[PDB]
Amino acid sequence: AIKPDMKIKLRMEGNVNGHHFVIDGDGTGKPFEGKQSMDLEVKEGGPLPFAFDILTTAFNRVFAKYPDNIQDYFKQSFPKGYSWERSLTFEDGGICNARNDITMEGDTFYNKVRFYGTNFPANGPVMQKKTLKWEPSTEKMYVRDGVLTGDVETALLLEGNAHYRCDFRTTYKAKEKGVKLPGAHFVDHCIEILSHDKDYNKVKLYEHAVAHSGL
C-alpha cells in the first residue's frame, strides 16, 4: 500500500491566542527510511504574531524507520488511514490542542490539521518570537486503556542560553478496527526548519524518525 516514495498534501486551520490562520503544505517522504520534507505556506492570517516553532510538530509517524521486531501500527493503518489528537503543555501555562486525520489516495497522504493554542503570556517567548528550535527527543510509545499513546518531555531552545519546556501526549487511532496495537517502544526524532522567509510565511521543514527498543 505504502511506496518507497510518497507525496504529502496538508491544510492546517487554527487559532493561537485568538489569531486565526490557514497554512497549506506540499512535500515528499521516504516512509521506510523515516524521512519527510515539506514546503509550508501561510495563506491566511500572516504574518503570524507568534513563534512558528509551536506549529511544526502538527505538520505522520508513517515516516518512521521501524525495525522488523516492532509492530508498525502506522504502515498497517493504510490504506484507510489513522487520526491523532495531541496536547502541548508549556511550562508558562501555554496549552495547544492539535488533531490530524490522515488519508491516502494513490501515492499521496492527505492531512486535515487543526491546531488550537491558548493561555500564552503576551510577554513570553511564543508571543514575542524568541524561539530558535526544538531539541531532538525520544517519544515513549505504550498502550493506555486500548489506545496507543505517545509521550515526549522536550524543550524549545530560546535566544539567550535558555530552554522553554513542553510535554506532548499524543493518542493514535487506526480507522480500521482490527489493526493490532504494538508493544511499547521508543521513537527518536529530529525536526528542523531548513529555510524560511522574513515572517515565516514560507517554510521548508524536515523530520527524521527511528523506532527502537532502547538498545
Side-chain angles (χ1 to χ4, degrees), residues 5 12 30 35 55 61-62 71 76 87 94 99-100 104 110 149 156 160 165 181 209-210 212:
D5 286 297
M12 166 182 284
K30 328 203 139 228
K35 296 169 186 210
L55 304 170
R61 272 292 195 244
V62 87
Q71 158 81 172
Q76 302 302 303
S87 64
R99 84 188 50 104
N100 193 359
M104 195 186 62
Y110 283 90
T149 307
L156 295 152
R165 287 247 153 229
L181 303 160
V210 179
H212 64 88

Side-chain angles (χ1 to χ4, degrees), residues 30-176:
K30 328 203 139 228
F32 299 100
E33 292 185 18
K35 296 169 186 210
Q36 63 184 309
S37 63
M38 64 188 67
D39 295 307
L40 302 175
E41 183 157 2
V42 175
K43 293 301 182 70
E44 294 198 23
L48 303 186
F50 55 86
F52 199 91
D53 286 316
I54 61 158
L55 304 170
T56 53
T57 65
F59 294 120
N60 181 2
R61 272 292 195 244
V62 87
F63 296 109
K65 192 168 191 296
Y66 266 79
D68 292 328
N69 61 344
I70 300 163
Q71 158 81 172
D72 191 345
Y73 191 75
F74 310 108
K75 287 185 185 78
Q76 302 302 303
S77 278
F78 292 93
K80 197 86 184 91
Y82 75 97
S83 310
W84 54 253
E85 302 203 283
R86 155 149 11 117
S87 64
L88 287 79
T89 306
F90 296 88
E91 76 170 78
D92 64 359
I95 315 198
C96 308
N97 297 290
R99 84 188 50 104
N100 193 359
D101 305 295
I102 307 176
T103 60
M104 195 186 62
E105 311 285 348
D107 60 352
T108 296
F109 295 113
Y110 283 90
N111 298 262
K112 174 189 207 181
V113 195
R114 297 298 178 255
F115 189 103
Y116 303 112
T118 197
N119 211 36
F120 290 107
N123 63 3
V126 172
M127 296 307 304
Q128 292 293 326
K129 300 170 177 188
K130 308 293 299 177
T131 67
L132 290 185
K133 62 180 176 166
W134 288 102
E135 294 289 10
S137 73
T138 305
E139 177 182 37
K140 277 165 267 150
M141 304 293 260
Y142 54 95
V143 178
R144 204 198 155 160
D145 195 11
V147 173
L148 181 57
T149 307
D151 289 338
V152 178
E153 309 176 7
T154 184
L156 295 152
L157 181 73
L158 310 180
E159 295 196 344
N161 295 344
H163 284 93
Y164 182 52
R165 287 247 153 229
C166 194
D167 299 338
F168 297 40
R169 181 153 291 156
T170 303
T171 49
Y172 298 95
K173 299 193 167 119
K175 284 151 182 291
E176 295 290 313

